[PDB]
C-alpha cells in the first residue's frame, strides 16, 4: 500500500491499481471506499470517484505522479456518494465520465452530479458497445438490481480482476451493508449473475473490503438468499 494525502493506493496488477478513500461519520467511524485505476496503453481509465471532490482530485494527482498518463475516462458504478461523490473533480479536469443511464437519472435525486454520458445494456446484462466508446479492457456488466437498481460491475480484460462495487461483500462480511436502496428479492440472483459474467476472474475487488477470491461472490449471494 502507498499513502498519498488521505488516500491509499495498492497495485493489484502490472496495469491495475486500487484507490481507497475514507469518509468519517459520527457514531459509525471511518468508512473506506475502493475504486480502480487502469493503465491501458497510453491512457488511464478510472472506475468510481472517491467520497468527495477533493479526494477525487487527489486520485488524479496520484495518477499524474505515479503513471503520468492522461486519464481518458471514468466509469461510476451507481448513484451513491462513495461512487459518484467526486464527479466535479473529474469534470473540472475535463475527464469524460460514464454511468448507467439509470444512475444519471437518479443522480440529481441522490444529490449527485450526473455523469456526462449514459451507458445502456442488453437483456443479458452486457453493455451496449455503442454506449461504451473506447473502454479498452473495461467490460461493463449490469447484473440486475441488488445493492441498488442501477448498480453496475466492471471486469478488467487481460487480468484476473473483476470489480463488483457495493453489490459484492467479502467472504467475512456479516451483512450486505446499506440495504436502504436495495432490491432484496433480486439481490441474490444479481450477485450470481456477476459471478457468471466474469467466470475466470479470480481476484474480486469491491467497495468496502480488500480484494477477495470468488468466495466473496458466493458468500454474498447466500447472504442475499436470506432476504427473500
Ligand atoms: C453512504 C453510501 O455511499 C453507502 C452506499 O453506497 O449505500 C456506502 C457506505 C455503505 S458501508 C455499510 C457497512 N459497511 C462498512 N464497512 C455502503 C455499502 O454497504 O456498500 N456503501
Ligand atoms: Zn451504494
Ligand atoms: Zn458502498
∠ CA 11-80-63 to the nearest 5 degrees? 30
Q: At what angle do helices 187-197 and 215-225 cross, to 10 degrees?
A: 160
Residue 78, ligand 1, Cβ within 6 A: no
The number of beta carbons lying within 10 Å of the beta carbon of residue 91 is 16
Query: Edge-to-edge, what's the strand order for the sheet holding 29-40?
Result: 2-4, 7-13, 16-25, 29-40, 43-47, 71-76, 96-100, 117-119
Single out the residue of 34, 8, 31 nearest to residue 168, CA to CA: 34
Question: How was this one solved?
Answer: X-ray
Q: What is the resolution of this structure in A?
A: 2.0
Looking at the CA of 81, name the nearest ligand. Answer: 1
Domain 1-228 class?
Answer: alpha beta
Residue 178, ligand 1, Cβ within 6 A: yes
Single out the residue of 147, 153, 99, 144 nearest to residue 123, CA to CA: 144
Which residue bears the cell 456526462? 116
**Measured between alpha carbons, how far is 204 from 18 in angstroms, rounded to an integer?**
11
To test the pocket of ligand 1, the residue of 148, 166, 223 to mutate (highest count of ligand atoms within 8 Å of its CB) is: 166
Contacts of 128 (CB under 8 A, 6+ apart): 119, 120, 121, 122
Looking at the CA of 180, name the nearest ligand. Answer: 1
Rg (CA), the chain: 16
Amino acid at each position: 500500500d502507498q499513502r498519498f494525502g488521505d488516500l491509499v493506493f495498492r497495485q493489484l496488477a502490472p496495469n491495475v491499481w486500487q484507490h481507497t478513500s475514507y469518509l468519517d461519520m459520527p457514531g459509525f467511524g471511518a468508512v473506506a471506499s475502493n475504486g480502480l485505476i487502469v493503465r491501458d496503453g497510453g491512457r488511464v481509465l478510472v472506475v468510481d470517484t472517491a467520497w468527495t471532490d477533493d479526494q477525487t482530485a487527489q486520485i488524479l494527482n496520484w495518477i499524474k505522479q505515479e503513471i503520468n498518463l492522461p486519464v481518458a475516462l471514468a466509469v461510476v458504478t451507481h448513484a451513491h456518494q462513495d461512487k459518484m461523490g467526486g464527479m466535479d473533480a473529474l469534470h473540472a479536469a475535463g475527464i469524460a465520465t460514464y454511468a448507467n443511464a439509470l444512475s444519471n437519472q437518479l443522480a440529481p435525486q441522490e444529490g449527485m452530479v450526473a455523469a456526462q454520458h449514459s451507458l445502456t445494456f442488453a437483456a443479458n446484462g452486457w453493455v451496449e458497445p455503442a454506449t461504451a466508446p473506447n473502454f479498452g479492457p473495461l467490460k461493463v456488466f449490469y447484473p440486475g438490481p441488488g445493492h441498488t437498481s442501477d448498480n453496475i460491475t466492471v471486469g478488467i480484460d487481460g487480468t484476473d480482476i473483476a470489480f463488483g462495487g457495493c453489490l459484492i461483500k467479502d467472504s467475512k462480511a456479516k451483512s450486505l451493508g446499506n440495504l436502504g436502496d436495495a432490491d432484496t428479492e433480486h439481490y441474490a440472483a444479481s450477485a450470481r449473475a456477476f459471478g457468471a459474467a466474469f467466470p475466470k476472474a479470480s481476484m474480486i475487488v469491491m467497495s468496502h473490503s480488500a480484494p477477495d477470491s470468488r468466495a466473496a461472490i458466493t458468500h454474498t449471494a447466500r447472504m442475499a438468499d436470506k432476504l427473500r
